[PDB]
Amino acid sequence: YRGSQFKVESFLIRICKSESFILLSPGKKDVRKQKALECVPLVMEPESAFYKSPLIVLDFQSLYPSIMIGYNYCYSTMIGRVREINLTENNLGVSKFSLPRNILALLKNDVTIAPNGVVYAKTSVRKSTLSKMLTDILDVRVMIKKTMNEIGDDNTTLKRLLNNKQLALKLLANVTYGYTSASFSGRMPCSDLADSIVQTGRETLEKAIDIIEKDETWNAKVVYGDTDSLFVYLPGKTAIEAFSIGHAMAERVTQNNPKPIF
Amino acid sequence: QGNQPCWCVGSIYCEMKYKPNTYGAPDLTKSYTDKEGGSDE
Amino acid sequence: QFDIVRELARVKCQISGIMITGRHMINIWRALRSDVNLTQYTIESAAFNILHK
Amino acid sequence: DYFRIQLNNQDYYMSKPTFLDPSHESLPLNQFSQVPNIRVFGALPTGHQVLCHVHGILPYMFIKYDGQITDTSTLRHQRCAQVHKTLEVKIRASFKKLGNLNFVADVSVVKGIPFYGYHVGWNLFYKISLLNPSCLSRISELIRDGKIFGKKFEIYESHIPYLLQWTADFNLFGCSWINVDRCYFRSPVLNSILDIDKLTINDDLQLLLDRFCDFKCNVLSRRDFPRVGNGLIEIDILPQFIKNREKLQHRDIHHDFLEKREELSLKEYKETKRHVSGHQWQSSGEFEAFYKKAQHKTSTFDGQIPNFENFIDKNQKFSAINTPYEALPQLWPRLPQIEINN
16 A cells, blocks of 8 residues: 555664664654755766667666665764754754764764765764664575575475565665655655765766776776666677676676675 | 156267467467366266 | 445444455555556456466 | 464554553553554464454654653653643644543653664653554644644654554564463354354364463453454453564663674575775765864864763763663553452
């Protein structure tokens, strides 16, 4: 019936009661008065050509789960809005909250700076709730994948359970950016958190395109940019050898990026 | 069903379908053909 | 002129077919099977689409 | 012993107070007027789709302002009197003195870190339990209107429905096997003249329910608390009676500082990257520069002691009061169905 935005609420409320956090609510008039903006992902389309040259699939397996775990841009560390930051008042997200006075100056070291300007702590002092959530989703995902790939033939006895559990975890993970969906028909939108996480996904994608464009040895040119994945066209690059260059390029981007992203 | 046998004037349509043969999915239907049709009842 | 919804319910009393109390339906109205073309996947069409029969 | 139902669809149930329903506070002498409790239509092992009335769960939500750091631990009752007095004025404002009042339950205070906000100091919020789960959204928007009270407060828990709050409490996941303790059953298998009792029963499930009663006063009386609903055998549970894993931990280093499921018995069970080292995003240098500048503008300027160990321990003279994992089992074991009255 509800479809979206709701399973992630139940799993997050399970985790944050397990870590004894206390959730908040907006009212709908307060949803419509969030100063709600959308710094959209500025992905850009390809040019009109045939692209006879073979192409590579970059295949970020998830933007928003993998960057919630990898960068800790979570719900539970929203202390930011460097533009007009003060002790008394912070109109960040859905409501208007104060901040304690020294703990941000005390937290000068532990900030990961967002590209839109909300200062977010590392996991080294926090071990964040949403980070724990999507840590659990990637851990369960790789357990399911490895057990599915290890059982052998398994002619529709346990393989059905493993693949439908796989699709259940994937159907959680694609909509966990939802409930940061930032619409009028939403509960706890937190629109500038969505701005932060998709803008750092965009700049992660630009870090992918400038590890692509500055690697002259693995010569390529970006053509199709999009959110979940990226496509370059490898100019005349003998695709049986692109079977090597895609895996080696994937190792070169995973080593560039932090640990969880594959 | 009356136990005295009457003259049962009727026409036999017991088994008539095809041993040799896919828009209408015939072979999946023809699984029912092979075993039941083979029985001569 | 009779309420069968209460007897279909596991519960005994309350004091469009959108939702039956204590129960839950499944099919096409809230739940597409494969495609964004929900009307396309009527049960005569999806007989061959997925079951191949 | 090692068995209970799975969890299908649910709904709430606007029940009048009964023995084994918790009527006992904000004002201790008054009971509630209509206690909403959860009906579960759960699936037991090997079929036997049963309906169980789970008492005890009440819709609890929090509010914005705080209990006093030292006063409310000593004396909660004048603050609770003020809260449920103002909510009684909100009952007078409802759309259609006042003992056994219809809509508001106990309003005691529960601590925690606000998930929204990142304040590591525990912050008391008054856990206003309610009695009308339909109206909680409505009266919460009446609070946000502030028609009566001079200021508008934050309503908490993302105003989730009573179903979701209930399944949040006990880790009681949908379609999931759990366990229970030695417990009390409501009634036997009814609809005996109907064909449910003849064939749909199965002998392994009476071998499952070999421990169902203690003394056969465990059955709930039909003249006071009748077996409402059609189905197989009902074993009622209190929220004290749920002997789940209950693995909603303390995780107390959420309040302290770190500087200071899904398990398979399948035989196989198969299971480092370079850091970005100054991960500039080509505009984040200006944002961290203005972060440093506004930080120096928003610093102390007196008593400069920036230690993670220091900032908890100034706050930690605040005492240990009701936690969210203490709020749930609180105030309704109440020696259940002790039945001194006949």
